[PDB]
Amino acid sequence: YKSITIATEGSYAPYNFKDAGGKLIGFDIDLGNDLCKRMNIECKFVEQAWDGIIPSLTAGRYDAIMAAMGIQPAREKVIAFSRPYLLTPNTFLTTADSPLLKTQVAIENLPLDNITPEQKAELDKFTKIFEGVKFGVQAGTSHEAFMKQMMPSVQISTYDTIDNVVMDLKAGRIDASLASVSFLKPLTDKPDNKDLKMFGPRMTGGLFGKGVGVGIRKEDADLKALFDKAIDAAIADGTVQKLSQQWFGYDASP
Ligand SMILES: N=C(N)NCCC[C@@H](C(=O)O)N1C(=O)CC[C@@H]1C(=O)O
């Protein structure tokens, strides 16, 4: 390889978004550039809407995806992934005045790989509390899949971008949402968002898979091996931890 094009969304701060000059910035951009430097590959980042991000990769419009993409089992049927470059659980979001905040959480860290009767009872409790609660999630995500598969009785609205979900939550058009802690913690840490709060179990596994990875075509085994070697090196030397603290305000490195 000499040069690659990496697609990102540009609507998921602080992983990938746009600066004042309209340039793509974020953890995914800084990490992508760092990995390409380690691989000795010229790096170009391109903006791509979420709906076509995977088919544009398999159609050969670009070489890789770095766009806060969970290493999701359903996506693994279509594309390959690098080893994880970030780890995160997933949790709920509501307003600071919501009565949902008073809900007791019985299972703080809830793994979904092998749901026990105890874990199912906790999911069922939140499903019942969510009756009559209007949820909003980003379309085409594991958050949409979790609500449709694990909480089908809950009213759900899907949105083109997470920015429109947050806008409708602030406006009172929806009552709650679901996204990763890596997205929600920096969002709720902003003084701009003192009126928003994370709540509920912090979920991992199951349909979410494990970690965030670089999406790569299945046939590009050499490119995956190059990314995996570079990611291992960037974790080992503290680069992923450094960039995670810079963008997220905490260490989400594997
Ligand atoms: N708009 C974007 N560029 N990405 C949205 C990814 C949302 C979701 C996913 O992959 O479907 N995520 C998870 O399931 C774990 C990590 C990731 C997230 O919410 O940060």
Residue numbers in the entry: 28 to 281
In the authors' words:
To learn more on the role of Met117 residue in the interaction between NocT and its ligand, we constructed two NocT mutants with different short polar residues: NocT-M117N because an asparagine is found in the OccJ sequence and NocT-M117S because a serine is found in the LAO/HisJ sequences. Both mutants displayed a similar KD for pyronopaline that was 76-fold higher than that of the WT protein, proving that Met117 is a key component of the ligand affinity and belongs to the nopaline-binding signature. We also obtained the structure of NocT-M117N in complex with pyronopaline. Prior to this, the stability of NocT-M117N was verified using differential scanning calorimetry (DSC) and, compared to the WT protein, the mutant presented similar Tm (60.12°C versus 60.25°C for the WT) and ΔH (1.59 105 cal/mol/°C versus 1.4 105 cal/mol/°C for the WT), meaning that mutating M117 has no significant effect on protein stability. The structure of NocT-M117N in complex with pyronopaline confirmed that the replacement of Met117 with Asn led to a loss of hydrophobic interaction with the ligand and showed that His170 which is free to move towards Asn117 bound the carboxyl group of the α-KG of the pyronopaline in a position not observed in the WT complexes. A loss of the polar interaction between the side chain of Ser169 and the terminal OH of the pyronopaline ring was also observed due to steric hindrance.
